[PDB]
Amino acid sequence: KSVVFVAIDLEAYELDQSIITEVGLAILDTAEITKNWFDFIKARHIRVKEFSWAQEYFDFGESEFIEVAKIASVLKETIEGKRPVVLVFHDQSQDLKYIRMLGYDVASADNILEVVDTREMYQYLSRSNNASKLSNVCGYLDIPWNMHNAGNDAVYTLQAMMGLAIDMRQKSLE
């Protein structure tokens, strides 16, 4: 049994929302660990080569430059290669729009097992005691985070959910 976790983030130009400028991908193939999960996270930052003027580096690899016409096939290869895929988003509606605008048809993919939106879970956690504590500590620290990079955005999203999922599982078995 194997599942491919795919975290995705896309950015659009501030002054022209029809222009998609970067794609962040963070992949975790459980088949590659079936024992230290975060070492097996494959991250990619894709800068749209036609729109690199439309305006941070990539902290988990080297940023790629790809033409807009080639982006869709890259996304299709990532998601469809068919092995079951779990999509992880923050703000699912916004990112699904951006993916469509790049020429990829998510609906065509028959191998999507689940879609996870952290924006829902974090909203849900907004009235959580322990979650609020963590926020206060991070708010106190005011840590300055390279920060708009879609590649980083996707990695942090995947690490957060995988770390949470693994822990909840292990603690439930004991």
Place this chain on the structure above:
Amino acid sequence: EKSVVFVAIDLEAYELDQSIITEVGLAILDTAEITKNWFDFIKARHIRVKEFSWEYFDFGESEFIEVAKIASVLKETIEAKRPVVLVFHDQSQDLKYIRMLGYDVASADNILEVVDTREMYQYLSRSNNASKLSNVCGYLDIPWKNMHNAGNDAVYTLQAMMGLAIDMRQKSL
């Protein structure tokens, strides 16, 4: 430079006698050490408690320390100076064990926050997205060896909360 020390703790008691402490798990993250990537700066310790001085641990080598010295080890870890965030799973049980070792963590005045993941997971039990992850992990049924190891238990606890806290912060900005 403002800094906080995150300390994840797990203790284990003997199966047949909950008065006998057998293991202590510590996972430390000093934010001052990042002010690479955050999880690379996590310092883990596994202590098997020997009663007298004359599975495995996947994040280092297990230490052997006598019961009489454990309290000071914990106190040194927590304490005094810099603010400490305590991270537990089942806070009451672990605080009990520590007290029985002669150290009163609650007495420590440098405690900024105390986080109990067992509460959050209870709260997340009726979460839509959390349930999705659970079903996938239940299907995969990935076998993690040495899951009862108190050292590993603390590392997974800290990684889960730090990864969650960092992400929640960045996405809110």
